[PDB]
Design a protein around this ligand. Structure first.
Ligand SMILES: [Mg+2]
Ligand SMILES: [Mg+2]
Ligand SMILES: [Mg+2]
Ligand SMILES: [Mg+2]
Ligand SMILES: [Mg+2]
Ligand SMILES: [Mg+2]
Ligand SMILES: [Mg+2]
Ligand SMILES: [Mg+2]
Ligand SMILES: [Mg+2]
Ligand SMILES: [Mg+2]
Ligand SMILES: [Mg+2]
Ligand SMILES: [Mg+2]
Ligand SMILES: [Mg+2]
Ligand SMILES: [Mg+2]
Ligand SMILES: [Mg+2]
Ligand SMILES: [Mg+2]
Ligand SMILES: [Mg+2]
Ligand SMILES: [Mg+2]
Ligand SMILES: [Mg+2]
Ligand SMILES: [Mg+2]
Ligand SMILES: [Mg+2]
Ligand SMILES: [Mg+2]
Ligand SMILES: [Mg+2]
Ligand SMILES: [Mg+2]
Ligand SMILES: [Mg+2]
Ligand SMILES: [Mg+2]
Ligand SMILES: [Mg+2]
Ligand SMILES: [Mg+2]
Ligand SMILES: [Mg+2]
Ligand SMILES: [Mg+2]
Ligand SMILES: [Mg+2]
Ligand SMILES: [Mg+2]
Ligand SMILES: [Mg+2]
Ligand SMILES: [Mg+2]
Ligand SMILES: [Mg+2]
Ligand SMILES: [Mg+2]
Ligand SMILES: [Mg+2]
Ligand SMILES: [Mg+2]
Ligand SMILES: [Mg+2]
Ligand SMILES: [Mg+2]
Ligand SMILES: [Mg+2]
Ligand SMILES: [Mg+2]
Ligand SMILES: [Mg+2]
Ligand SMILES: [Mg+2]
Ligand SMILES: [Mg+2]
Ligand SMILES: [Mg+2]
Ligand SMILES: [Mg+2]
Ligand SMILES: [Mg+2]
Ligand SMILES: [Mg+2]
Ligand SMILES: [Mg+2]
Ligand SMILES: [Mg+2]
Ligand SMILES: [Mg+2]
Ligand SMILES: [Mg+2]
Ligand SMILES: [Mg+2]
Ligand SMILES: [Mg+2]
Ligand SMILES: [Mg+2]
Ligand SMILES: [Mg+2]
Ligand SMILES: [Mg+2]
Ligand SMILES: [Mg+2]
Ligand SMILES: [Mg+2]
Ligand SMILES: [Mg+2]
Ligand SMILES: [Mg+2]
Ligand SMILES: [Mg+2]
Ligand SMILES: [Mg+2]
Ligand SMILES: [Mg+2]
Ligand SMILES: [Mg+2]
Ligand SMILES: [Mg+2]
Ligand SMILES: [Mg+2]
Ligand SMILES: [Mg+2]
Ligand SMILES: [Mg+2]
Ligand SMILES: [Mg+2]
Ligand SMILES: [Mg+2]
Ligand SMILES: [Mg+2]
Ligand SMILES: [Mg+2]
Ligand SMILES: [Mg+2]
Ligand SMILES: [Mg+2]
Ligand SMILES: [Mg+2]
Ligand SMILES: [Mg+2]
Ligand SMILES: [Mg+2]
Ligand SMILES: [Mg+2]
Ligand SMILES: [Mg+2]
Ligand SMILES: [Mg+2]
Ligand SMILES: [Mg+2]
Ligand SMILES: [Mg+2]
Ligand SMILES: [Mg+2]
Ligand SMILES: [Mg+2]
Ligand SMILES: [Mg+2]
Ligand SMILES: [Mg+2]
Ligand SMILES: [Mg+2]
Ligand SMILES: [Mg+2]
Ligand SMILES: [Mg+2]
Ligand SMILES: [Mg+2]
Ligand SMILES: [Mg+2]
Ligand SMILES: [Mg+2]
Ligand SMILES: [Mg+2]
Ligand SMILES: [Mg+2]
Ligand SMILES: [Mg+2]
Ligand SMILES: [Mg+2]
Ligand SMILES: [Mg+2]
Ligand SMILES: [Mg+2]
Ligand SMILES: [Mg+2]
Ligand SMILES: [Mg+2]
Ligand SMILES: [Mg+2]
Ligand SMILES: [Mg+2]
Ligand SMILES: [Mg+2]
Ligand SMILES: [Mg+2]
Ligand SMILES: [Mg+2]
Ligand SMILES: [Mg+2]
Ligand SMILES: [Mg+2]
Ligand SMILES: [Mg+2]
Ligand SMILES: [Mg+2]
Ligand SMILES: [Mg+2]
Ligand SMILES: [Mg+2]
Lengths: 117, 52, 101, 154, 112, 137
RNA sequence: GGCGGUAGGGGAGCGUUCCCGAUGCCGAUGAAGGCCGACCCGCGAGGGCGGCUGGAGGUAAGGGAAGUGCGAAUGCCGGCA
RNA sequence: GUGAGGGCGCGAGCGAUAACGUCCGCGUCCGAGCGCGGGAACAACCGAGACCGCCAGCUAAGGCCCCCAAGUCUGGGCUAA
RNA sequence: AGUACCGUGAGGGAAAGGUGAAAAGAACCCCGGGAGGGGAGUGAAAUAGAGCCUGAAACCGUGGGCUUACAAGCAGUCACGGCCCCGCAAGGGGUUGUGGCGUGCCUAUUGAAGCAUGAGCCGGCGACUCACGGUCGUGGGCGAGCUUAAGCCGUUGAGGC
C-alpha cells in the first residue's frame, strides 16, 4: 500500500491561502509567506483584544475628565466623589452621559462635589 | 555574475513602477493637400507627390 | 427614559423597548426577567447607594444564541509552538418593555 | 538505494561547486532514487493457539444456535447436482434467499447444486471455520458434517 | 455585436508587441490603420495584420459596417517559450528563451 | 457602543501672549489644538480649536534661557549643524519660539501635522480679523 | 480547585493508501478530482451543505494493515520569475 | 531528555578591591516566561506567572505639565547650577 | 531505450503514455505570403480541435470595484469613519483614510529582527521501518502446565494432524 500525497497537501495550503486574502504582495500568493504572516496576525489580534479594553478604558476617561472639567473638577476629584458618594453606577463607559443628557451628568457632578467634601 | 549583484528580487510592483515612462506615443500624422491620405509632416509620401 | 441596568457583569442603558444582546442568562426560551439591577432614569434619578433602593426594568428573553467564531491563535517563535482554538461565545437576546421606575 | 539500477559515481565533487552535495542518483532523496523503508515480501501468518481455534469454532456455531439460525439436516431429496433441485429443496427447508446460507456437507453433488448460488457458500465438513460461519447469516449442515464437527469439538 | 480575431503562436516577445497594441486600444478603426501603418516597431506588422483580419470577420461574418467599428478591446497573452542554448565563456551555457505571443483584437459597432 | 462624534465646526480662539510663560502657555495651547478639552473628543478625527496667538514677542521665560536656550538645526551637509540661542530667535522671527515649543508637544503623526496648521502665531497683536476672536486666558 | 512552556514522558483525535464489510449500496437526474461560499456541526486536525466545473467512477456503520500528512535538508525533478 | 549554561544579590579565591573576565558556595530570574505593565528602547533590574471571551470593575511597579492615562493637588523647607 | 546525448575508452545514461462511442479529424467561404484566426459543418460535449480527458499553483495579461503623489516601513492587527456590492431588515462582504499597538520563518544557541545558518516562487519526490531475539506493559486462551517446528493430509482465500 503506497499512500501518495494526493490531494491532501494542496487542500491544506489552499485552506491557509484563503485566510491570507488581501495581504500585500507575495504575502497572499505564496503559501510560505502567507503562513508566516498569519502566525503574526493571530498573535497580534489576540494581543490587541486584551488591548481594546485598555484603549476605551482611556477613551472614556478623556471624555469624562473633559466634561467633568466644565463643571469644575479633575477626573481624580470627580471619581473620589461617586466612589465615596456610593454611586458605583457609571462604569466609566456610561459616563458617556456627558454627551447626551449633560444635565444627568451635572446631577452626578453636584452629587459628587457634595458627598466628596 | 562577478562583483555587483542584485540583493533582492525586484518587487513585481517596483518593477512595473520602473516601467512608468515606458509607454509609446502615436506617430504625428497630418492630412496632405495632395491625396486625402495621411503623411507625417515635412515628408513627401506615396499616393501624393509634391511640388519642387 | 434612559435607564442604566447592570447584568452579566456589564452596565448598559436601556430605551423603552428595543433588542439587546447580553451575557448568557438562565431563563426560558421565551420567558420574562426583571433586571431589578438598575441605576438612574430619564427624569434624573441619581442612584444613591450603588443601586436604586426601589426600581426595576422588565425584559423578554427573545432567545439564546452563539456568536461568530473567533480564532484565538498563539504562536511562540524559535520553539515550534503553535496553538489554534476556535471560540464562539454564548449569549441571550433581551427585548426591553417596561422600564417601570 | 542498493537494488536501484544506477551507478556508484559521485554525481559531483562536493567542494567549491556551489551545487548542493551528493553521492549518487541511488540516494533516496533523488527523484528516481531508491526507496526508503518501503515494503519487502513478508509472511503475515502466525500460529494462533489451538485451544483458541476450537473455542472459536464452537462459539461461532453456538452463536448461530442461540440465534436459532443453525439447522442440521439429512433430508437432501434434490440429489443429482442441479441447482434447480437444491433450489426447490431449500424452498421446503425454509431457505429461500432472504438470508445468506453457509451450506456444509460431504456430498459433492449437494455442493455442485448450491454452489453457483450467490446467497450460498458451499463447504466440506473439514472446511468449517469462523470467518465463513460469521460471514453468513445462516448455518445449515449435514448430520455427517455436524458429527465430524463434534469430532473436532463435542 | 462584438467581433474577435486571434493570431496564436506569433514568434515575438509579449512585452515587445504589448507596447504597440496598447497604442490602438479603444480607437477608431481608420485611426488605428493609420497609427500602426506609421508606428516604428516590428510589432506593428503583426498587430496590424490581425487588427485587419478582425475587421474582415466583422464585415463578412457579423455584418458590422466597416465605417463605424472600433477597438472594443485587444490584449496579448504569452504563448509557450522557445528555449535555445547560448554558449558562454569558460564553458558555462545560458539557455536563451525565445518567447512567443497570442494577440487578440476584438472590434465593436461604433455606437447607438 | 461608544459614541462617535459627527461633523462639528471649528471654534476659533484668541490667546494673548504677553507675560505668559513659554512652556506653560504651549501646554494649554496644544490641548486645544487636539480637542482634548471637548468631551465629544476622538483621536482619529482631529477637531480641536483654531488657536490664535498674538504678541508672542512678549513671551516671558524663567532664568538665563534668553542666553542659554539654544536651538539646533541640522542641514544635511557636513558640519551643517547650525545652532541658535533664544535671544537671536526673539530678535528675528519671534513667533518661531512659540511655534516649535508647541510643535514639540503635538503628536508625531500626520494629523499631528494637520493639527499644526490649526495654530496661527503672531506678534502685534492684530491678526487677519477673520470672524471669531473669542479671547481667552 | 488546576490549566505559560523548550528538551522530554503520557493521553485523546483528525486525514491519505489498501483489505473484510461487497454477488451489496451511491452513481449520467452526474463517480473522482478541480473551482467557490459571508452557511452548519467540531476546541482542533477535520467533517457537511450549496452553486459552478468534470464525464466514470466511488465505497458507510464497525474493524483490519501501512510506502500515511513537508516550508525549509547550499535537498531531488519540473514550471515560471 | 541533560552532562556548553547565562545574568543579578550575597560570601571567597584568581585578577589590578580591571573586565558583558574568571572559579566555587547560597539564592534567584532567563534558559523554557524574547508572553503582559514599569525601566525611552533592552532575556534575566522593579511589578506579575497569559485556559478562552467582555466597548465592566480594584490595584502592582511606576506614574499624574503637553507628546501620553491620571493633580499644573495641599502644606513646610532647600537649591539658581 | 541500453536508445538520444556524454566519454578516447572501460563506462555513464534521460526525457517522452490518454481527442472522441465513432474520425464523424472540420468540405466550402472570409482576412493572411504562410502560421493563425472568423463563419459553415461533425459531436452529447470542440474552454474534447489533434502532444487535444481532468486541468491545480507560481507566473503574464484585459476589464471592473475600492484606494494612493507632505509620506517613515516584518506590511499585520485593534477601533472609527468614507466609498462600492449583497439584504425587508438588523446584518454581511470588498477596499483603505486617521488613530493605537507591533523586531520576518527555521536552525543553532548563555543569548538573534538580527549585520549568525538555510530558503527566488510554486507544484510533485523526501527521513524512525522491517526480520529474528530480548524486556516490560497490555487483550485474550489454557494452567502444574502451556505450546508445538520442519513436515503430512486437506484446500485453492478451509482447516486439520
Ligand atoms: Mg509524501
Ligand atoms: Mg470547507
Ligand atoms: Mg483585512
Ligand atoms: Mg512572526
Ligand atoms: Mg480604568
Ligand atoms: Mg454635547
Ligand atoms: Mg436627546
Ligand atoms: Mg514618456
Ligand atoms: Mg511632384
Ligand atoms: Mg431593593
Ligand atoms: Mg518573535
Ligand atoms: Mg530554538
Ligand atoms: Mg528565531
Ligand atoms: Mg520549529
Ligand atoms: Mg418613576
Ligand atoms: Mg545503469
Ligand atoms: Mg548499473
Ligand atoms: Mg549501486
Ligand atoms: Mg566508488
Ligand atoms: Mg568543501
Ligand atoms: Mg549559490
Ligand atoms: Mg546523494
Ligand atoms: Mg556512496
Ligand atoms: Mg530520472
Ligand atoms: Mg527514470
Ligand atoms: Mg524507481
Ligand atoms: Mg431462538
Ligand atoms: Mg428476513
Ligand atoms: Mg511600419
Ligand atoms: Mg458594410
Ligand atoms: Mg496588455
Ligand atoms: Mg561570449
Ligand atoms: Mg531569464
Ligand atoms: Mg494685554
Ligand atoms: Mg543680553
Ligand atoms: Mg561637529
Ligand atoms: Mg559656515
Ligand atoms: Mg496681522
Ligand atoms: Mg473551572
Ligand atoms: Mg499546557
Ligand atoms: Mg497515543
Ligand atoms: Mg493505488
Ligand atoms: Mg443508483
Ligand atoms: Mg434532477
Ligand atoms: Mg479514490
Ligand atoms: Mg482510488
Ligand atoms: Mg460540494
Ligand atoms: Mg471503514
Ligand atoms: Mg515516507
Ligand atoms: Mg520543519
Ligand atoms: Mg524544496
Ligand atoms: Mg530550474
Ligand atoms: Mg530547481
Ligand atoms: Mg531565468
Ligand atoms: Mg560542565
Ligand atoms: Mg555555572
Ligand atoms: Mg543553574
Ligand atoms: Mg547562576
Ligand atoms: Mg564582574
Ligand atoms: Mg522558571
Ligand atoms: Mg520585550
Ligand atoms: Mg538600558
Ligand atoms: Mg527571555
Ligand atoms: Mg524581559
Ligand atoms: Mg479606580
Ligand atoms: Mg495607590
Ligand atoms: Mg502608586
Ligand atoms: Mg508644595
Ligand atoms: Mg514646597
Ligand atoms: Mg522506449
Ligand atoms: Mg526515444
Ligand atoms: Mg532516440
Ligand atoms: Mg562527442
Ligand atoms: Mg564519442
Ligand atoms: Mg530529467
Ligand atoms: Mg516518445
Ligand atoms: Mg477515415
Ligand atoms: Mg476554422
Ligand atoms: Mg473562393
Ligand atoms: Mg490572399
Ligand atoms: Mg489565398
Ligand atoms: Mg490552421
Ligand atoms: Mg486556415
Ligand atoms: Mg464557427
Ligand atoms: Mg450540432
Ligand atoms: Mg445528456
Ligand atoms: Mg469536455
Ligand atoms: Mg499544442
Ligand atoms: Mg475519457
Ligand atoms: Mg488592470
Ligand atoms: Mg484600471
Ligand atoms: Mg464590481
Ligand atoms: Mg476604477
Ligand atoms: Mg505611509
Ligand atoms: Mg494601521
Ligand atoms: Mg450596493
Ligand atoms: Mg434576496
Ligand atoms: Mg426592525
Ligand atoms: Mg462584496
Ligand atoms: Mg515590546
Ligand atoms: Mg551555529
Ligand atoms: Mg555559536
Ligand atoms: Mg538550550
Ligand atoms: Mg536583514
Ligand atoms: Mg557569516
Ligand atoms: Mg539571516
Ligand atoms: Mg555554522
Ligand atoms: Mg536553516
Ligand atoms: Mg544566501
Ligand atoms: Mg539559483
Ligand atoms: Mg513543495
Ligand atoms: Mg494469561
Ligand atoms: Mg497449500
Amino acid at each position: 500500500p503506497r499512500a501518495k500525497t494526493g490531494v491532501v497537501r494542496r487542500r491544506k495550503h489552499k485552506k491557509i491561502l484563503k485566510l491570507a486574502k488581501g495581504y500585500w504582495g507575495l504575502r497572499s500568493k505564496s503559501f510560505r509567506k502567507a503562513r508566516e504572516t498569519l502566525f503574526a496576525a493571530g498573535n497580534y489580534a489576540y494581543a490587541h483584544r486584551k488591548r481594546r479594553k485598555r484603549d476605551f478604558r482611556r477613551l472614556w476617561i478623556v471624555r469624562i475628565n473633559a466634561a467633568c472639567r466644565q463643571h469644575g473638577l479633575n477626573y481624580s476629584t470627580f471619581i473620589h466623589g461617586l466612589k465615596k458618594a456610593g454611586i458605583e453606577v457609571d462604569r466609566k463607559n456610561l459616563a458617556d452621559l456627558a454627551v447626551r443628557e449633560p444635565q444627568v451628568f451635572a446631577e452626578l457632578v453636584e452629587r459628587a462635589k457634595a458627598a466628596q467634601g | 555574475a562577478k562583483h555587483p549583484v542584485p540583493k533582492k528580487k525586484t518587487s513585481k510592483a517596483r518593477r512595473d513602477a520602473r516601467r512608468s515612462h515606458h509607454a509609446l506615443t502615436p506617430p504625428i500624422l497630418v492630412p496632405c493637400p495632395e491625396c486625402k491620405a495621411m503623411k507625417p509632416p515635412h515628408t513627401v509620401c506615396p499616393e501624393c507627390g509634391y511640388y519642387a | 427614559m434612559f435607564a442604566i441596568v447592570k447584568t452579566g457583569g456589564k452596565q448598559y442603558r436601556v430605551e423603552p423597548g428595543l433588542k439587546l444582546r447580553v451575557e448568557k442568562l438562565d431563563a426560558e426560551p421565551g420567558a420574562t426577567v426583571e433586571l431589578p439591577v438598575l441605576l438612574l432614569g430619564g427624569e434624573k434619578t441619581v442612584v444613591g447607594t450603588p443601586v436604586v433602593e426601589g426600581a426595576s426594568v422588565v425584559a423578554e428573553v427573545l432567545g439564546h444564541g452563539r456568536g461568530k467564531k473567533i480564532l484565538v491563535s498563539k504562536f511562540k517563535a524559535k520553539v515550534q509552538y503553535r496553538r489554534k482554538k476556535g471560540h464562539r461565545q454564548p449569549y441571550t437576546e433581551l427585548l426591553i418593555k417596561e422600564i417601570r421606575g | 538505494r542498493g537494488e536501484v539500477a544506477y551507478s556508484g559515481r559521485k554525481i559531483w565533487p562536493q567542494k567549491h561547486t556551489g551545487r548542493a552535495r551528493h553521492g549518487d542518483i541511488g540516494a533516496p532523496i533523488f527523484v528516481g532514487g531508491g526507496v526508503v523503508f518501503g515494503p519487502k515480501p513478508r509472511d503475515y501468518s502466525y500460529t494462533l493457539p489451538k485451544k483458541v481455534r476450537k473455542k472459536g469454532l464452537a462459539m461461532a456455531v453456538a452463536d448461530r444456535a442461540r440465534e436459532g439460525k443453525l439447522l442440521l439436516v439429512e433430508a437432501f431429496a434434490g440429489v443429482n447436482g442441479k441447482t434447480k433441485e437444491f433450489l426447490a429443496w431449500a424452498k421446503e427447508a425454509g431457505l429461500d434467499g432472504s438470508e445468506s446460507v453457509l451450506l456444509v456437507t460431504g456430498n459433492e453433488l449437494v455442493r455442485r447444486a448450491a454452489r453457483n448460488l450467490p446467497w450460498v457458500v458451499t463447504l466440506a465438513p473439514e472446511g468449517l471455520n469462523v470467518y465463513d460461519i460469521v460471514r453468513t447469516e445462516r448455518l445449515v449442515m449435514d448430520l455427517d458434517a455436524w458429527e465430524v464437527f463434534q469430532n473436532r469439538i463435542g | 455585436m462584438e467581433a474577435k480575431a486571434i493570431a496564436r503562436y506569433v514568434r515575438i516577445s509579449p512585452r515587445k508587441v504589448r507596447l504597440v497594441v496598447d497604442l490602438i486600444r479603444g480607437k477608431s478603426l481608420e485611426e488605428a490603420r493609420n497609427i500602426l501603418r506609421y508606428t516604428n516597431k516590428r510589432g506593428a506588422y503583426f498587430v496590424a495584420k490581425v487588427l485587419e483580419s478582425a475587421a474582415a470577420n466583422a464585415v463578412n461574418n457579423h455584418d458590422m459596417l466597416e465605417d463605424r467599428l472600433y477597438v472594443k478591446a485587444a490584449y496579448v497573452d504569452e504563448g509557450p517559450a522557445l528555449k535555445r542554448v547560448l554558449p558562454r565563456a569558460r564553458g558555462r551555457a545560458d539557455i536563451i528563451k525565445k518567447r512567443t505571443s497570442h494577440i487578440t483584437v476584438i472590434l465593436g459597432e461604433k455606437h447607438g | 457602543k461608544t459614541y462617535v462624534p459627527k461633523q462639528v465646526e471649528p471654534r476659533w480662539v484668541l490667546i494673548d501672549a504677553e507675560g505668559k510663560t513659554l512652556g506653560r502657555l504651549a501646554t494649554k495651547i496644544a490641548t486645544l489644538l487636539r480637542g482634548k478639552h471637548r468631551p465629544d473628543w476622538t483621536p482619529n478625527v482631529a477637531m480641536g480649536d483654531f488657536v490664535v496667538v498674538v504678541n508672542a514677542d512678549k513671551i516671558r521665560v524663567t532664568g538665563k534661557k534668553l542666553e542659554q536656550k539654544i536651538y539646533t538645526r541640522y542641514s544635511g551637509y557636513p558640519g551643517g549643524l547650525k545652532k541658535i540661542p533664544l535671544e537671536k530667535m526673539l530678535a528675528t522671527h519671534p513667533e518661531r519660539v512659540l511655534e516649535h515649543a508647541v510643535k514639540g508637544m503635538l503628536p508625531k503623526g500626520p494629523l499631528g501635522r494637520r493639527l499644526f496648521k490649526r495654530l496661527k502665531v503672531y506678534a502685534g497683536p492684530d491678526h487677519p480679523h477673520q470672524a471669531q476672536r473669542p479671547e481667552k486666558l
